[PDB]
Amino acid sequence: PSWPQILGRLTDNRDLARGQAAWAMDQIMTGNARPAQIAAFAVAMTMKAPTADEVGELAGVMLSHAHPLPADTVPDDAVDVVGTGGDGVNTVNLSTMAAIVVAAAGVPVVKHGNRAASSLSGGADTLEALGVRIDLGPDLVARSLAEVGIGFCFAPRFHPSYRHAAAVRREIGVPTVFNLLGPLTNPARPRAGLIGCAFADLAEVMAGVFAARRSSVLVVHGDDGLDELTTTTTSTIWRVAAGSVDKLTFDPAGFGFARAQLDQLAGGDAQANAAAVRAVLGGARGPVRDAVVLNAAGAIVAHAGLSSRAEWLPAWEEGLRRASAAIDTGAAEQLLARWVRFGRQI
Amino acid sequence: PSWPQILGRLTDNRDLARGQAAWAMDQIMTGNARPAQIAAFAVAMTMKAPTADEVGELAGVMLSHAHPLPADTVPDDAVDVVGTGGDGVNTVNLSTMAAIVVAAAGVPVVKHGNRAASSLSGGADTLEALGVRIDLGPDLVARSLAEVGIGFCFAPRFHPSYRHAAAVRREIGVPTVFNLLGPLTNPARPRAGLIGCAFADLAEVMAGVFAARRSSVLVVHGDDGLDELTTTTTSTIWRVAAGSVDKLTFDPAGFGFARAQLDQLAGGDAQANAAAVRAVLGGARGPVRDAVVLNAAGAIVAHAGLSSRAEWLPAWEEGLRRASAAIDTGAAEQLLARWVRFGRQI
Ligand SMILES: O=P(O)(O)OC[C@H]1O[C@H](OP(=O)(O)OP(=O)(O)O)[C@H](O)[C@@H]1O
Ligand SMILES: O=P(O)(O)OC[C@H]1O[C@H](OP(=O)(O)OP(=O)(O)O)[C@H](O)[C@@H]1O
Ligand SMILES: Cc1ccc(Nc2ccccc2C(=O)O)c(C(=O)O)c1
Ligand SMILES: Cc1ccc(Nc2ccccc2C(=O)O)c(C(=O)O)c1
Ligand SMILES: [Mg+2]
Ligand SMILES: [Mg+2]
Ligand SMILES: [Mg+2]
Ligand SMILES: [Mg+2]
């Protein structure tokens, strides 16, 4: 393989041969690619239209180089709640809030995350503001998961060899296939998740990668552009189970959710978004709570999907009940406090 | 303007707004663009499919930064003979040989050129091997033109600010819109030319740029892939005159040219290609001479087109007569000798 061969094939609007995307990502991860080559590859793959096989190869190479968690420390039913980011809406941290609520319901959560790229405060920024240790290594993330019920894998901590690609993503500024990689490369490799995708045209491809792994995931794109299940309108869901993908449209009105305005979900700096987390966990009612409960329920539905017996509507109803109860009993608020104490007691 | 705005527009498969391509190229030439940004732009523009407006903006910025020739030193009817390169067929230096013959016929030639990128010997390499100086600045190129009848503008010498783009081109290896820029950025700005394009899908766009400038040009693509008028099969010509482009198919068999095999035009290192030049100018008959005469006649037809009264078939017949006579009288051989002599006596 060579860069001229691979890049030439992409600019010819052709799918890559098996193994070529992998070779490219390996060159990138081993420090052997010039920034110009990295950028040309990211752009060319995006404009060709990436296939699930290709994106799967990219994510597979990243995972092969990532720091793993210790043997037998991640439950077979652990879930992730994470999105691509890049929706350009600057909301409160819906995935992070949902993750806390899901863990409080008793579903093990190992969340992959990072600081903000374009928004005012990303999941990692907000957790930091709440006093959570975001940059623990493999052994301590495993310990967090076992003792608290949730662990957070900071992407830069677990994927240090991606640093050159991460720099190129920032330099070019335009979204590319690389923006899909975060949700696809959780180093703990959980088999379930609620996975947000800001890019309507790339969501089916992400779903295809998860299908190949036989994960149970809901890949979600709010029809208002959110990389979350939205409350302002419908969301498109690519449901992944039994190695298959099927496309659905989801309307929260079917479960009694009132319509919100996008401005009602607006986020601020890390202190503001941390205050938003505390308000929800403290039982404040309103649009933010509704969106958190909806997303937590989605992640519980994906968890349920790890069983072949699970049915869609009963799963949502149970998920909504469990999410609401986790907040209402104080379990979610207490879990966050316990998570903060865990990090200080190490 | 910003890179995210411009690159985002290209990845959305949209034509740029007026001025955006120019802004991008100016950033590139002022040293303000990261290699990753240069690469992303070159690739995205290529895959979107560049327009003549866009490519003309890129070339316009290059020419605005280039070292120009001194005032009133380039004849209004000066012609260029130059191609994109990148046809991967590794031939003898047909444009360079044609240029010498054209000048010997009495048409002023200012040729733009560079060393090889993928072939074994490019035009500048072969001229160097022949003892011609390829390192002359604007004043001396003007003098060469006045005294010998031909001048050679070495691209790196006249476009030093392009060094960052040139580096990126080498790093990624794949052809892009940047590969069109050489024939479009002759710093002497001649109004006529025979212009080779290896990329069949970009030849019409090059023609459009010349049409905007009201040049008289033949943009040529051999149907065997040569960035020259070929002798092995037909050629496609985009004829540019009066600000208009029309596409023609050209068969040299119509003027009594035997069909050649591509093997018969193959080149070697600089020393070998120099020997091919000496052989042709010395009167050696065979397929290389045929291809040189054909391309020289093409350039003479483009020069003829600077008059609105010119007519296609008579022009070709006269161009072929003049090209053949320039060789047969010894004028071409003697012109090369005088060109070598000029540079040794500076
Ligand atoms: O700055 P942006 O590109 O818009 O990214 C917004 C955030 O969403 C993603 O994470 P995640 O979904 O884990 O965080 P969330 O809690 O904010 O949803 C991403 O890692 C950022 O943290
Ligand atoms: O290495 P490659 O990319 O194949 O390019 C072959 C040559 O063709 C172009 O020049 P030009 O047409 O001026 O010279 P020539 O046709 O006489 O070689 C290019 O600048 C190279 O010199
Ligand atoms: C999937 C993933 C993983 C890590 C990422 N970032 C980094 C990787 C290595 C070193 C530093 C960083 C960083 O973003 O600061 C990124 C990124 O920021 O694009 C994405
Ligand atoms: C149109 C044009 C002009 C100059 C070029 N190369 C250079 C430009 C500045 C400095 C050095 C070079 C070089 O190729 O050595 C190039 C190029 O090599 O791609 C193209
Ligand atoms: Mg999210
Ligand atoms: Mg989000
Ligand atoms: Mg040529
Ligand atoms: Mg050529």
Q: Return the CATH number at A41.
A: 1.20.970.10
Contact check, Cβ <8 Å, B43/A40? yes
Residues B108, B44 within the same domain: no
Residues A183, A58 within the same domain: no
> What three-state secondary structure class fits B1?
coil
Contact check, Cβ <8 Å, A40/B44? no
- Crossing angle of helices A287-304 and A270-281, in 10° steps, is 70
Rounded CA Rg of chain A: 19
Strands A79-83 and A216-222: unpaired
Last residue of a domain, one of A66, A94, A119: A66
Strands B192-196 and B244-250: unpaired
Residues B154, B30 within the same domain: no
Residues A117, A200 within the same domain: yes
Contact check, Cβ <8 Å, A173/B7? yes
Last residue of a domain, one of B15, B32, B66: B66
Method of determination used here: X-ray
In a mutational test of the pocket of ligand 4, which residue from B25, B63, B162, B169 has the highest number of ligand atoms less than 8 Å from its CB? B162
Residue A24 touches chain B, beta carbons under 8 Å? no
Question: Would you state the torsion angle of the CA atoms of residues A55, A60, A61, A63, taken in this order, to the nearest 10 degrees?
Answer: 130
Sign of CA dihedral A153, A154, A160, A164: positive
Contact check, Cβ <8 Å, A43/B43? yes
Separation of alpha carbons B191 and B84, rounded Å: 18
Distance A276 CA to ligand 6 centre (A): 14
Residues B19, B149 within the same domain: no
Residues A55, A190 within the same domain: no
Last residue of a domain, one of B37, B66, B95: B66
Residues B165, B214 within the same domain: yes
Work out the angle at residue A167's Cα, subtended by the Cα atoms of residues A162 and A171, and round it to the nearest 5 degrees. 150
Distance A262 CA to ligand 3 centre (A): 29
Backbone angles phi, psi at A180, to 5 degrees: -85, -15
Termini Cα distance of chain A: 47
One-letter amino acid of B302: A
Residue B36 touches chain A, beta carbons under 8 Å? yes
Cβ–Cβ < 8 Å for A156, A166 = yes
Separation of alpha carbons B164 and B152, rounded Å: 23
Chain mean position to CA B326: 21
Work out the angle at residue A291's Cα, subtended by the Cα atoms of residues A290 and A297, and round it to the nearest 5 degrees. 90
Separation of alpha carbons A117 and A180, rounded Å: 13
Sign of CA dihedral B135, B140, B141, B147: negative
Residue B27 touches chain A, beta carbons under 8 Å? no
Task: Indicate whether residue A231 lines ligand 1 (CB < 6 A).
Answer: no
CB pairs under 8 A between A and B: 94
Cβ–Cβ < 8 Å for B231, B259 = yes
Cβ–Cβ < 8 Å for A182, A157 = no
> Domain containing A204 — which CATH number?
3.40.1030.10
Separation of alpha carbons B292 and A230, rounded Å: 68
Cβ–Cβ < 8 Å for B110, B254 = no
Q: What is the 3-state secondary structure (H, E, C) of A55-108?
A: HHHHHHHHHHHCCCCCCCCCCCCCEEEEECCCCCCCECCHHHHHHHHHHHCCCC
Chain mean position to CA B228: 9
Separation of alpha carbons B220 and B213, rounded Å: 18
Cβ–Cβ < 8 Å for A154, A196 = no
One-letter amino acid of B88: G
Domain ranges, residue A35: 1-66
Domains held by chain A: number:
2
Residues B62, B182 within the same domain: no
